Amino acid sequence: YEPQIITTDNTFVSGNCDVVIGIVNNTVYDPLQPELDSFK
Amino acid sequence: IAIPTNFTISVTTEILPVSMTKTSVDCTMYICGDSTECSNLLLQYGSFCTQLNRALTGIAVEQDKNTQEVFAQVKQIYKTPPIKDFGGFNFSQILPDPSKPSKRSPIEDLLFNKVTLAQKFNGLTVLPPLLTDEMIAQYTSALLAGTITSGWTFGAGPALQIPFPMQMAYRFNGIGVTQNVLYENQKLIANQFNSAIGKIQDSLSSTPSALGKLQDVVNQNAQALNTLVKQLSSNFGAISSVLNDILSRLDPPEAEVQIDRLITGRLQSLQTYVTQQLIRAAEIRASANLAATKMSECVLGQSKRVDFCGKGYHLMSFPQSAPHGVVFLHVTYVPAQEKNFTTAPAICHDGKAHFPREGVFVSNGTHWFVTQRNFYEPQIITTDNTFVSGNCDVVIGIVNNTVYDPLQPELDSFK
Amino acid sequence: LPPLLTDEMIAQYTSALLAGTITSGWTFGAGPALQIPFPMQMAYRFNGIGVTQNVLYENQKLIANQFNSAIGKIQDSLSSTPSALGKLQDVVNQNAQALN
Amino acid sequence: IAIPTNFTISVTTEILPVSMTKTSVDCTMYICGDSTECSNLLLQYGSFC
Amino acid sequence: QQLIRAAEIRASANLAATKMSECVLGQSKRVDFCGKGYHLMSFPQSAPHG
Amino acid sequence: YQDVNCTEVPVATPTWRVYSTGSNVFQTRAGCLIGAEHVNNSYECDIPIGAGICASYQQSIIAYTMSLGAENSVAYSNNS
Numbered sequence: 036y037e038p039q040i041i042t043t044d045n046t047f048v049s050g051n052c053d054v055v056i057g058i059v060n061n062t063v064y065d066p067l068q069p070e071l072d073s074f075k
Numbered sequence: 076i077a078i079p080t081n082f083t084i085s086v087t088t089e090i091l092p093v094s095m096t097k098t099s100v101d102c103t104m105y106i107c108g109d110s111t112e113c114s115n116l117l118l119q120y121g122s123f124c125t126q127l128n129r130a131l132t133g134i135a136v137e138q139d140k141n142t143q144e145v146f147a148q149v150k151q152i153y154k155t156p157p158i159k160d161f162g163g164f165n166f167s168q169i170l171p172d173p174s175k176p177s178k179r180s181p182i183e184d185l186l187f188n189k190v191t192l193a194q195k196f197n198g199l200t201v202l203p204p205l206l207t208d209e210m211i212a213q214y215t216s217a218l219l220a221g222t223i224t225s226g227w228t229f230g231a232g233p234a235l236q237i238p239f240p241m242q243m244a245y246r247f248n249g250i251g252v253t254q255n256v257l258y259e260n261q262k263l264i265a266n267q268f269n270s271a272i273g274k275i276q277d278s279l280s281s282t283p284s285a286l287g288k289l290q291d292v293v294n295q296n297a298q299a300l301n302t303l304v305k306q307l308s309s310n311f312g313a314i315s316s317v318l319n320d321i322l323s324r325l326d327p328p329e330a331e332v333q334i335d336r337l338i339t340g341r342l343q344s345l346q347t348y349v350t351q352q353l354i355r356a357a358e359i360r361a362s363a364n365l366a367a368t369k370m371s372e373c374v375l376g377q378s379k380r381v382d383f384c385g386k387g388y389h390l391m392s393f394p395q396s397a398p399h400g401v402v403f404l405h406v407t408y409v410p411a412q413e414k415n416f417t418t419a420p421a422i423c424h425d426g427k428a429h430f431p432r433e434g435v436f437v438s439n440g441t442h443w444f445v446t447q448r449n450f451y452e453p454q455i456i457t458t459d460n461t462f463v464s465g466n467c468d469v470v471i472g473i474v475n476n477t478v479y480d481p482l483q484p485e486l487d488s489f490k
Numbered sequence: 491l492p493p494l495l496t497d498e499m500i501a502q503y504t505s506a507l508l509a510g511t512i513t514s515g516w517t518f519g520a521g522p523a524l525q526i527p528f529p530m531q532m533a534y535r536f537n538g539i540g541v542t543q544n545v546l547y548e549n550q551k552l553i554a555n556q557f558n559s560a561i562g563k564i565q566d567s568l569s570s571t572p573s574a575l576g577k578l579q580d581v582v583n584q585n586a587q588a589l590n
Numbered sequence: 591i592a593i594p595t596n597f598t599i600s601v602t603t604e605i606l607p608v609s610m611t612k613t614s615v616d617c618t619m620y621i622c623g624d625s626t627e628c629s630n631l632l633l634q635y636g637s638f639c
Numbered sequence: 640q641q642l643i644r645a646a647e648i649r650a651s652a653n654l655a656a657t658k659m660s661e662c663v664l665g666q667s668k669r670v671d672f673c674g675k676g677y678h679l680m681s682f683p684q685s686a687p688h689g
Numbered sequence: 690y691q692d693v694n695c696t697e698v699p700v701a702t703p704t705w706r707v708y709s710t711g712s713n714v715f716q717t718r719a720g721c722l723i724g725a726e727h728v729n730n731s732y733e734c735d736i737p738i739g740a741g742i743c744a745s746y747q748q749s750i751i752a753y754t755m756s757l758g759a760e761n762s763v764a765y766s767n768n769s
């Protein structure tokens with residue numbers, strides 16, 4: 036048990052979220068966005 | 076290259092004997108039989124009978140040891156929840172059925188009904204097995220409930236629950252197919268699984284004799300024992316085959332020789348029978364050890380040894396009892412519907428050679444894609460599913476193609 | 491009594507197995523046989539024991555030379571030493587002696 | 591620590607026996623050898639043969 | 640004597656069958672089961688009785 | 690005594706006539722045992738008898754049906 040924030044580099048995307056049963060809603064934090072906002 | 080595009084689940088039956096009938100025979104009742112002078116003559120031959128009885132007792136105990144080793148492998152007796160919502164799967168065929176005889180599932184009942192087969196004779200005895208059939212059914216039910224509910228974790232330490240459609244999801248992950256395949260083909264997989272288990276019992280029942288080994292051993296034992304009894308009525312080069320006749324019709328000093336001849340013949344026959352029983356018990360114990368191994372590796376965990384359990388990539392197994400043995404049902408993943416493409420070792424872009432992180436390169440004729448090895452889900456070649464190494468010209472057989480970069484458009488819009 | 495399977499037929503089985511494992515990797519042991527270029531199969535075999543693929547793809551010629559030389563040496567090793575077999579002969583000797 | 595920098599592919603031989611010559615013995619003929627007296631005497635002994 | 644020898648030969652045959660199934664038809668992660676070193680692949684050959 | 694409808698036990702010396710007939714007689718599949726007390730509850734298997742009976746010493750000797758372990762049901766639900 037080592038909980039961690041759900042970023043976009045420890046998970047992968049595949050299709051849309053209709054076929055799977057049991058999908059939940061949440062936000063996947065992206066690491067590049069704060070740096071891009073800082074520097075643009 | 077040729078990559079599959081579809082799959083089939085399959086279930087395969089395996090049958091193994093684990094024990095034989097425990098028997099016991101004592102000399103004095105057999106060789107001589109309620110006669111004092113015959114016993115007096117036999118006493119001169121030494122201690123054959125003590126060692127014979129010891130040898131038979133060894134096998135008698137070893138049978139119980141075999142059963143204990145093969146079946147008794149759980150510290151606790153688990154139990155399925157009262158409701159059944161295993162994500163669409165259906166285990167009604169294998170789970171115990173209450174509205175029936177004591178505890179047996181339909182397949183176990185079919186097994187007991189299909190297999191069909193000694194009474195009290197002179198000097199022979201059969202000892203009851205130490206574990207009754209209900210206890211064996213209880214063990215198998217515990218194992219099945221544990222593996223349905225808690226995966227393989229109950230084999231190592233304490234049982235930890237897990238949703239079934241999620242444990243199979245990364246039971247695929249063992250054989251190299253990613254998770255989303257199951258989560259996007261759950262309904263089809265469940266239907267194939269249910270259909271296969273439905274077929275298996277008809278396959279067992281329709282074939283008149285597929286049990287084979289389980290029945291076979293029984294016959295052998297009976298046959299051997301019969302000959303022993305039929306060895307009792309033999310003159311062995313004497314006047315008559317009945318001891319009372321010999322003793323009554325002649326004086327003891329004369330009849331002693333005939334008594335001795337019968338003694339020698341019967342003793343030799345008993346020796347041969349015991350030797351045969353020992354040799355057979357060795358092989359049965361070997362099969363029991365193999366069964367215990369298969370139990371440990373295949374039921375309590377996934378296996379990576381090819382053709383150890385079923386044909387194809389292995390997923391799990393389910394045990395069932397039998398009159399004198401065990402029956403495994405192996406669930407396997409078999410690819411099918413292959414389609415062929417053209418490949419290349421590694422791309423060469425910008426003067427640098429790019430290799431795939433996990434998967435192969437394929438091409439439908441004009442464009443190039445990266446796909447996993449056991450399934451066909453093409454993806455655009457990016458810079459995060461490939462790794463760079465070395466220079467372009469070293470590798471033989473490379474091809475030219477661009478490698479898309481995800482960060483470039485994003486910084487292009489926001490320079 | 492004669493054996494049920496003649497020796498030529500055993501040789502045919504071994505040839506079939508060898509061809510299958512040469513030109514199809516090991517997929518023919520699970521389902522339908524699938525072809526794949528041999529150097530790619532060897533690359534995956536390396537990837538299966540903790541060595542990345544570029545190690546093979548850079549040193550293909552050296553791998554080939556070592557492989558060929560080793561197989562060449564096996565034949566001489568068998569031919570020279572007379573006790574190379576040493577185990578199949580023992581069974582025949584024991585059976586003949588017991589029957590005699 | 592110590593790590594390698596080279597390798598040598600090798601091939602090794604292993605040998606296993608799988609079968610032995612099938613055989614049979616004419617039980618009665620070996621003991622008696624086409625003699626009527628021996629054959630008649632042997633029937634007393636039983637079903638060893 | 641023949642019975643005991645046949646049992647031993649059966650043990651050897653079962654071992655050979657397991658080796659053929661597990662090493663010719665795929666890689667193996669069992670140490671020293673097939674060769675000394677890291678296993679890659681095996682090739683079979685026949686013999687008069689083995 | 691093995692394979693005997695136990696009523697026939699007295700038929701077949703100074704102190705042996707306390708283990709014949711007697712007061713406690715238990716009938717099992719293997720035979721009948723004299724000198725033990727039947728108990729309803731169950732424990733682990735001590736000295737075994739057959740057909741699921743394991744005699745033991747506790748201050749007397751008891752004969753009970755064998756136990757297979759402790760019940761344990763796993764709390765299983767489709768999102769836990």
Ligand SMILES: *[C@@H]1O[C@H](CO)[C@@H](O[C@@H]2O[C@H](CO)[C@@H](O)[C@H](O)[C@H]2NC(C)=O)[C@H](O)[C@H]1NC(C)=O
Nearest residue numbers: 051052053054055056057058059060061062063
């Ligand atoms: C998860 O988020 C999605 C996206 O907003 C939700 O789907 C929509 O929810 C709103 C809420 O009122 C509905 O009006 C829409 O009809 C839904 N669908 C679409 C396509 O917009 C969804 O309800 C959220 N919750 C779950 C459990 O999925």
Ligand SMILES: *[C@@H]1O[C@H](CO)[C@@H](O[C@@H]2O[C@H](CO)[C@@H](O)[C@H](O)[C@H]2NC(C)=O)[C@H](O)[C@H]1NC(C)=O
Nearest residue numbers: 080081082083084262263264266267270411412
């Ligand atoms: C993979 O094979 C399965 C069957 O093994 C396909 O499922 C069948 O699809 C057809 C479509 O016309 C249906 O009529 C059948 O009823 C389906 N069978 C079952 C058991 O449901 C499946 O479509 C194949 N995969 C793909 C991608 O086509």
Ligand SMILES: *[C@@H]1O[C@H](CO)[C@@H](O[C@@H]2O[C@H](CO)[C@@H](O)[C@H](O)[C@H]2NC(C)=O)[C@H](O)[C@H]1NC(C)=O
Nearest residue numbers: 159160163164165166167168181269270272273
């Ligand atoms: C699980 O499978 C069993 C047997 O395959 C199902 O039991 C049968 O269900 C059919 C449905 O119409 C009945 O007609 C039969 O009488 C049932 N009993 C049999 C065949 O012995 C069971 O319904 C399935 N469970 C689920 C949840 O689908």
Ligand SMILES: *[C@@H]1O[C@H](CO)[C@@H](O[C@@H]2O[C@H](CO)[C@@H](O)[C@H](O)[C@H]2NC(C)=O)[C@H](O)[C@H]1NC(C)=O
Nearest residue numbers: 416437438439440441442443444453454455456
């Ligand atoms: C090979 O695959 C590519 C990728 O899908 C195909 O290119 C696209 O194919 C779709 C399918 O009809 C078209 O709608 C697109 O317009 C195509 N181009 C692009 C840029 O997406 C290509 O047609 C395939 N070739 C063959 C021979 O199957």
Ligand SMILES: *[C@@H]1O[C@H](CO)[C@@H](O[C@@H]2O[C@H](CO)[C@@H](O)[C@H](O)[C@H]2NC(C)=O)[C@H](O)[C@H]1NC(C)=O
Nearest residue numbers: 422423424425426467468472473474475476477
């Ligand atoms: C991949 O692209 C490179 C870059 O153009 C190709 O390399 C050129 O090949 C031509 C062929 O004779 C030479 O004349 C050029 O001098 C090469 N230039 C460089 C920078 O190497 C290469 O041939 C292409 N490979 C394939 C398979 O198309």
Ligand SMILES: *[C@@H]1O[C@H](CO)[C@@H](O[C@@H]2O[C@H](CO)[C@@H](O)[C@H](O)[C@H]2NC(C)=O)[C@H](O)[C@H]1NC(C)=O
Nearest residue numbers: 549551552553555556557559595596597598599
């Ligand atoms: C690894 O060892 C091999 C030999 O086992 C080296 O290859 C030899 O290189 C020398 C010099 O180029 C040649 O004279 C030999 O003929 C080569 N041997 C063979 C069998 O071809 C190789 O150089 C070594 N690795 C490194 C990085 O040096």
Ligand SMILES: *[C@@H]1O[C@H](CO)[C@@H](O)[C@H](O)[C@H]1NC(C)=O
Nearest residue numbers: 056057058160162766767768
């Ligand atoms: C779990 O089962 C319950 C039934 O009580 C159902 O309502 C729920 O939707 C299920 N959850 C998922 C993720 O399928």
Ligand SMILES: *[C@@H]1O[C@H](CO)[C@@H](O)[C@H](O)[C@H]1NC(C)=O
Nearest residue numbers: 076414415416417438439440
């Ligand atoms: C392999 O694919 C090519 C086209 O890419 C096709 O022409 C050929 O027939 C295929 N080989 C088969 C089906 O054996």
Ligand SMILES: *[C@@H]1O[C@H](CO)[C@@H](O)[C@H](O)[C@H]1NC(C)=O
Nearest residue numbers: 418419420471472473474527
């Ligand atoms: C494949 O074989 C053909 C045979 O003519 C040869 O021309 C081609 O160069 C080979 N390709 C590679 C990548 O070795």
Ligand SMILES: *[C@@H]1O[C@H](CO)[C@@H](O)[C@H](O)[C@H]1NC(C)=O
Nearest residue numbers: 693694695696697716717718
């Ligand atoms: C023993 O005999 C009695 C009467 O003779 C009979 O009622 C009883 O059923 C017998 N016990 C068994 C186990 O058959």
Ligand SMILES: *[C@@H]1O[C@H](CO)[C@@H](O)[C@H](O)[C@H]1NC(C)=O
Nearest residue numbers: 726727728729730731751753
């Ligand atoms: C045990 O069970 C029997 C019958 O089931 C009953 O008569 C008895 O009271 C119970 N308790 C004891 C201590 O024997």
